[PDB]
């Protein structure tokens, strides 16, 4: 269950196997967004903001369950399990290395 | 009370002409009577007024695309003051 400052690797998409960072997560539609993944081009018309708006190329949302958070000490993707040490709960990557990949 | 019985002013071309002969318009809360509107502009604006007049608007009908509702009833009040200057702007 990823956070807003992670750096992950996809499994199944139009562009699979590519890495990248996460910039938003949308936790009611549970669809996250990664740079450089699945560009969806828009035909915006001339609005009151964009002076004579036109075509562009921006990556848009994909689901959570095509995205797996990879091991920082190994760079192989991994299920993340949780345990708690002292006051809070931290993410072990279940490859015996807990990550620090929040910020 | 006496600070929030007046609710909004209204700026209309009926009223913005009626700034010349110094009459103001307002929008008081529905349950008040015309005497204690006079005792409110004494408090809020600190002038003394000659007379006040009120009326009612019945709650006219809403749109049809936006479905069948009614806009809120309201109580437009008009105050008459004979020497107090421009309170609001």
């Amino acid at each position: 269950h990823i956070k807003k400052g992670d750096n992950v690797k996809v499994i199944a998409g139009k562009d699979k196997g590519k890495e990248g960072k996460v910039i938003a997560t949308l936790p009611k539609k549970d669809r996250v967004v990664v740079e450089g993944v699945n560009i969806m081009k828009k035909h915006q018309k001339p609005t009151q903001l964009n002076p004579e708006g036109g075509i562009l190329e921006t990556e848009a949302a994909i689901h959570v369950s095509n995205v797996q958070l990879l091991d920082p000490k190994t760079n192989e993707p991994t299920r993340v399990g949780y345990k708690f040490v002292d006051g809070k709960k931290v993410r072990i990557a279940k490859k015996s290395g807990e990550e620090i990949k929040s910020n | 009370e006496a600070r929030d019985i007046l609710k909004r002013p209204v700026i209309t071309e009926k009223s913005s002409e009626a700034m010349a002969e110094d009459k103001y318009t307002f929008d008081v809360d529905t349950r008040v009577n015309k005497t204690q509107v006079k005792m409110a502009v004494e408090e809020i604006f600190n002038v003394k007024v000659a007379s006040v007049n009120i009326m009612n608007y019945k709650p006219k009908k809403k749109r049809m695309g936006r479905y069948q509702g009614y806009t809120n009833k309201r109580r437009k009040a008009i105050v008459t003051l004979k020497e107090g200057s421009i309170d609001l702007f």
Binding site: - | R3, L6, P9
Partner: protein, 62 residues
């Protein structure tokens, strides 16, 4: 204004905050748009002051 319970005189503040609230709602119908500092995060404040005054008689009296 959050968590200010040790003030014996708040009726100096409620009257002062409420006449502040009327300075802007009356100012809303012409122009002057910054609607956050308008009636949302200020009308909550005059509810903060009453629930820390209305209980104050209650623990006092019985």
């Amino acid at each position: 204004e959050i968590r200010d319970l040790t003030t014996s005189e708040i009726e100096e503040q409620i009257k002062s905050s409420k006449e502040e609230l009327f300075n802007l709602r009356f100012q809303l119908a012409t122009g002057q748009l910054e609607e956050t500092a308008r009636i949302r995060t200020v009308r909550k404040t005059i509810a903060r002051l009453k629930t820390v005054a209305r209980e104050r008689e209650i623990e006092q009296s019985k």
